[PDB]
Symmetry: C3
Subunit: 116 residues, 3 copies
């Protein structure tokens, strides 16, 4: 019985609830489809954003997913490193899976493509 973390990241152009929820939602849908993740297999989820996003808690996008209301999620503030990717939201999803570490499909979207 193994537990694995699945990373993910994306960026928004403007700090607005609308775009934040849309792209956070898109990121999670990509992770879920790429890894075939069932909500019950998920231990917890950690969402984070750089200190320039204040419009809404990215976790709000999880409400539009099907069957994820029982997945515990908390939202943290990412480290502010001078010169780093701005307006970025990250995902650290902990899931149960027998799929090898080297095979986990981590998702990097938008301007966060320069990290993957």
């Amino acid at each position: 019985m193994m537990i694995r973390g699945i990373r993910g990241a994306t960026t928004v152009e403007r700090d607005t609830e609308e775009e934040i929820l849309q792209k956070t939602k898109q990121l999670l849908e990509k992770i879920i489809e790429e890894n075939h993740t069932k909500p019950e297999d998920v231990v917890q989820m950690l969402l984070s954003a750089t200190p320039d996003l204040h419009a809404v808690f990215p976790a709000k996008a999880v409400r539009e997913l099907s069957g994820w209301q029982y997945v515990p999620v908390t939202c943290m503030q990412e480290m502010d490193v001078t010169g780093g990717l701005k307006k970025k939201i990250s995902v650290m999803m902990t899931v149960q899976t027998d799929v090898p570490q080297d095979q986990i499909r981590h998702v990097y979207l938008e301007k966060a493509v320069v990290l993957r």
Copy 2:
């Protein structure tokens, strides 16, 4: 063998070591009793606070619990979203348990009741 995250949250009226330790302690006692959590089953713990609390590390309350000295705990700063719940402390306890996701008893106290 499954691992589950248990969420929790509370708020303090004033930024003081005394009230922070008291309510953080009360929150953890509620989580522990509601979920029947033994310290040895706990993988790790993540404590967080909004950027308006600076009086003390909430982790200091763990010292008054019985048999929890070996549980790894780190304290993070929560995301600052305009209009969110102020003076809030959160808990993301990762524990070992066969109890189904839909049955985990997440604890929301004080002004954090508006989230549960």
Copy 3:
């Protein structure tokens, strides 16, 4: 099948990429050797720094380790408590192991020695 978190912490004298990468690297090498940690057993890793470090993402040190490219890592900002240890970087490594909680070797280096 049990999952355990291994804590760690250190401090840097100056906010520079060079010293940050060196000491973060030294910290992880100490944790890995003290606990005999294989990269494949690691679920995920959480790196954090106090709000006074901006020179680089501590995760950059992981690139010099052997066989750790598939270990998911995210970097968070630690809670700013007045009077706390400044210029500190922490580690919350989640690993698979049958070694008892009371036996896990948590690593505290540099000025972070006052915490262990």
